[PDB]
Amino acid sequence: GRVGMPGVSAGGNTVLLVSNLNEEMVTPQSLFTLFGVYGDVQRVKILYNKKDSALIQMADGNQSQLAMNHLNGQKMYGKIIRVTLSKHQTVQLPREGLDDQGLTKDFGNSPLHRFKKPGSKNFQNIFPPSATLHLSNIPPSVAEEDLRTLFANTGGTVKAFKFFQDHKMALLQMATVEEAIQALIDLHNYNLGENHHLRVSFSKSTI
């Protein structure tokens, strides 16, 4: 085992509340890979009842408070993206994963992620943002010829792409860290190929 303490850095709540959204990226995979790159993630949900808000579910023990503090005011797309630890009961999704309505997203199957606890490929339980964007996914149906249109809409003006010649993985460079985080988030699920974005993330390397 690796856990058994009588508590954790959040409390055992497995939830993370968010506000001040743009309603233009805080719904699809983009938000899910946001909290999915800033740590482990259990689920997602969105709400608009007389107020714009959303909710994520996480491992609430060493990444939800970090992601909370750093995303609570980073304006990486055009909004304060307010964030806090939640204060109410967890979600329930007794349905297949969409609560038969769609405002919920039991995407915990991580169909675009392979994150794990510290011990390999990570040693900080989260990933800090940088202008460099390392990945695994380079399908034969999207390459520079379509990645051009992708980065041409992410936020920067480079996404310098460099890829292997004996594997299916690569790396990208945005012009700045803010558009870097928002660019790999925006394209984290954009390739439409057999590798269907195994992942994109930050690295110490450069291009």
Coordinates of C-alpha atoms in Angstrom, one line a residue:
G1 CA 0.0 0.0 0.0
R2 CA 0.9 3.7 -0.1
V3 CA -1.9 5.3 2.0
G4 CA -3.6 4.9 5.4
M5 CA -3.3 8.2 7.2
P6 CA -6.3 9.5 9.2
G7 CA -6.5 12.5 6.8
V8 CA -4.9 14.3 3.8
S9 CA -4.0 17.9 2.7
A10 CA -7.7 18.5 1.6
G11 CA -9.8 16.1 3.8
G12 CA -11.0 13.1 1.8
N13 CA -13.5 15.1 -0.3
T14 CA -12.3 14.2 -3.9
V15 CA -13.8 17.5 -5.3
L16 CA -12.6 20.8 -6.6
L17 CA -14.9 23.8 -7.3
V18 CA -14.2 26.3 -10.0
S19 CA -15.7 29.7 -11.1
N20 CA -15.2 32.7 -13.4
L21 CA -15.2 30.4 -16.4
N22 CA -15.3 31.4 -20.1
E23 CA -17.8 28.7 -21.1
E24 CA -15.7 28.3 -24.3
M25 CA -13.2 25.8 -23.1
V26 CA -14.4 24.9 -19.5
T27 CA -16.5 21.9 -20.6
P28 CA -14.7 19.6 -23.1
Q29 CA -11.5 17.6 -22.4
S30 CA -9.6 20.9 -22.1
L31 CA -10.6 21.5 -18.4
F32 CA -10.2 17.8 -17.7
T33 CA -6.6 17.8 -19.0
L34 CA -6.0 21.1 -17.1
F35 CA -6.7 19.4 -13.8
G36 CA -5.5 16.2 -15.3
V37 CA -2.0 17.7 -15.9
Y38 CA -1.9 19.6 -12.6
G39 CA -2.5 16.2 -10.9
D40 CA -4.6 13.0 -10.6
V41 CA -8.3 13.4 -11.5
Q42 CA -11.3 11.3 -10.8
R43 CA -14.2 13.1 -12.6
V44 CA -15.6 16.3 -14.1
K45 CA -18.9 18.3 -14.1
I46 CA -20.2 21.7 -15.2
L47 CA -23.0 24.0 -14.0
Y48 CA -24.7 27.2 -15.1
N49 CA -27.7 27.5 -12.7
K50 CA -28.1 31.3 -12.4
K51 CA -24.2 31.4 -12.2
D52 CA -21.3 30.2 -14.4
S53 CA -19.4 27.4 -12.4
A54 CA -18.0 24.0 -12.7
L55 CA -16.6 21.1 -10.6
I56 CA -13.8 18.6 -10.9
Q57 CA -13.1 15.5 -8.8
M58 CA -9.5 14.7 -7.9
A59 CA -7.3 12.8 -5.5
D60 CA -7.5 15.7 -2.9
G61 CA -4.2 15.0 -1.1
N62 CA -1.2 16.7 -2.8
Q63 CA -2.4 18.1 -6.1
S64 CA -5.9 19.6 -5.7
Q65 CA -4.7 22.4 -3.4
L66 CA -1.7 23.0 -5.6
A67 CA -3.8 23.1 -8.8
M68 CA -6.4 25.2 -6.8
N69 CA -3.9 27.9 -5.9
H70 CA -2.1 28.1 -9.3
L71 CA -5.3 28.0 -11.4
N72 CA -7.4 30.2 -9.1
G73 CA -6.1 33.2 -11.0
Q74 CA -3.9 32.5 -14.0
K75 CA -5.8 34.1 -16.9
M76 CA -4.3 31.6 -19.4
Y77 CA -7.2 32.0 -21.9
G78 CA -9.0 35.2 -21.0
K79 CA -10.6 34.7 -17.5
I80 CA -9.6 34.6 -13.9
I81 CA -10.7 30.9 -13.8
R82 CA -11.5 31.2 -10.0
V83 CA -10.8 28.0 -8.0
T84 CA -11.4 26.6 -4.5
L85 CA -11.8 23.3 -2.7
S86 CA -15.5 22.4 -2.7
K87 CA -17.8 22.5 0.3
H88 CA -20.6 20.0 -0.6
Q89 CA -21.2 16.3 -1.2
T90 CA -19.5 14.4 -4.0
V91 CA -21.1 13.6 -7.4
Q92 CA -23.0 10.3 -7.9
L93 CA -23.4 9.4 -11.7
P94 CA -25.4 6.2 -11.2
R95 CA -25.7 6.4 -15.1
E96 CA -23.1 5.2 -17.6
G97 CA -21.1 8.4 -16.8
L98 CA -23.2 11.4 -18.2
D99 CA -26.0 11.3 -15.6
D100 CA -28.3 11.0 -18.7
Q101 CA -28.1 14.7 -19.1
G102 CA -24.5 15.7 -20.1
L103 CA -23.6 18.4 -17.5
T104 CA -21.5 15.6 -15.8
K105 CA -18.4 13.9 -17.2
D106 CA -17.2 10.7 -15.5
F107 CA -14.2 10.9 -17.8
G108 CA -12.1 9.2 -15.0
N109 CA -11.2 6.5 -17.6
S110 CA -8.4 9.0 -18.6
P111 CA -8.9 8.2 -22.4
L112 CA -6.2 10.9 -23.0
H113 CA -3.9 10.5 -20.0
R114 CA -1.6 8.0 -18.3
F115 CA -0.5 10.0 -15.1
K116 CA 0.7 8.1 -12.0
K117 CA 1.9 8.8 -8.5
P118 CA 5.6 9.9 -8.0
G119 CA 8.3 7.2 -8.6
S120 CA 8.7 7.4 -12.4
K121 CA 8.4 10.0 -15.1
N122 CA 7.5 12.5 -12.3
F123 CA 8.9 13.4 -8.8
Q124 CA 6.6 16.3 -7.8
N125 CA 3.1 14.7 -8.0
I126 CA 2.2 17.6 -10.4
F127 CA 3.7 19.3 -13.5
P128 CA 4.7 23.0 -13.5
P129 CA 4.1 24.9 -16.7
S130 CA 6.8 25.8 -19.2
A131 CA 7.0 27.1 -22.8
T132 CA 8.0 23.5 -23.9
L133 CA 5.4 20.8 -24.6
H134 CA 6.5 17.1 -24.7
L135 CA 4.2 14.4 -26.0
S136 CA 3.4 10.9 -27.2
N137 CA 1.1 10.8 -30.3
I138 CA 2.0 11.6 -34.0
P139 CA -0.6 9.8 -36.2
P140 CA -0.3 9.7 -40.0
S141 CA -3.5 11.8 -40.4
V142 CA -2.3 14.9 -38.5
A143 CA 1.3 16.2 -38.7
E144 CA 2.7 19.7 -39.2
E145 CA 0.2 20.1 -42.1
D146 CA -2.7 20.1 -39.6
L147 CA -0.8 20.9 -36.4
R148 CA -0.2 24.2 -38.2
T149 CA -4.0 25.0 -38.0
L150 CA -4.1 23.8 -34.4
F151 CA -1.2 26.0 -33.1
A152 CA -2.5 28.7 -35.4
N153 CA -5.4 28.9 -33.0
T154 CA -3.9 27.9 -29.6
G155 CA -2.5 31.3 -28.5
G156 CA 1.1 31.6 -29.6
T157 CA 3.0 31.8 -32.9
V158 CA 5.4 28.9 -32.9
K159 CA 4.6 25.4 -31.4
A160 CA 7.9 24.3 -32.9
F161 CA 7.4 20.6 -33.4
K162 CA 10.2 18.0 -33.2
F163 CA 9.4 14.3 -33.5
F164 CA 11.1 10.9 -33.4
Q165 CA 11.9 8.8 -36.5
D166 CA 11.5 5.3 -34.9
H167 CA 8.6 6.0 -32.5
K168 CA 5.3 7.9 -32.4
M169 CA 6.2 10.7 -30.0
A170 CA 7.4 14.3 -30.2
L171 CA 7.5 17.7 -28.5
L172 CA 6.3 21.3 -29.2
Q173 CA 7.4 24.9 -28.2
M174 CA 4.9 27.7 -27.7
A175 CA 6.1 31.3 -27.6
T176 CA 5.2 31.7 -23.9
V177 CA 4.4 29.5 -20.9
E178 CA 0.8 30.8 -20.6
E179 CA -0.1 29.9 -24.2
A180 CA 2.1 26.8 -23.7
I181 CA -0.2 25.5 -21.0
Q182 CA -3.3 26.6 -22.8
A183 CA -1.9 25.3 -26.1
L184 CA -1.2 21.7 -25.0
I185 CA -4.5 21.9 -23.1
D186 CA -6.4 23.0 -26.2
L187 CA -4.7 20.3 -28.4
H188 CA -4.3 17.6 -25.7
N189 CA -7.2 15.8 -27.3
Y190 CA -6.8 17.0 -30.9
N191 CA -5.2 14.6 -33.4
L192 CA -8.0 12.3 -34.7
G193 CA -5.6 9.3 -35.2
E194 CA -4.7 5.8 -34.1
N195 CA -2.7 7.2 -31.2
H196 CA -5.6 9.5 -30.3
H197 CA -3.3 11.7 -28.1
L198 CA -1.7 9.4 -25.6
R199 CA -0.6 12.7 -24.0
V200 CA 1.1 16.1 -24.1
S201 CA 2.8 17.8 -21.1
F202 CA 5.7 20.0 -20.0
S203 CA 9.5 19.1 -20.0
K204 CA 12.8 20.6 -19.0
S205 CA 14.1 20.3 -22.6
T206 CA 13.7 22.9 -25.3
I207 CA 13.3 23.2 -29.1

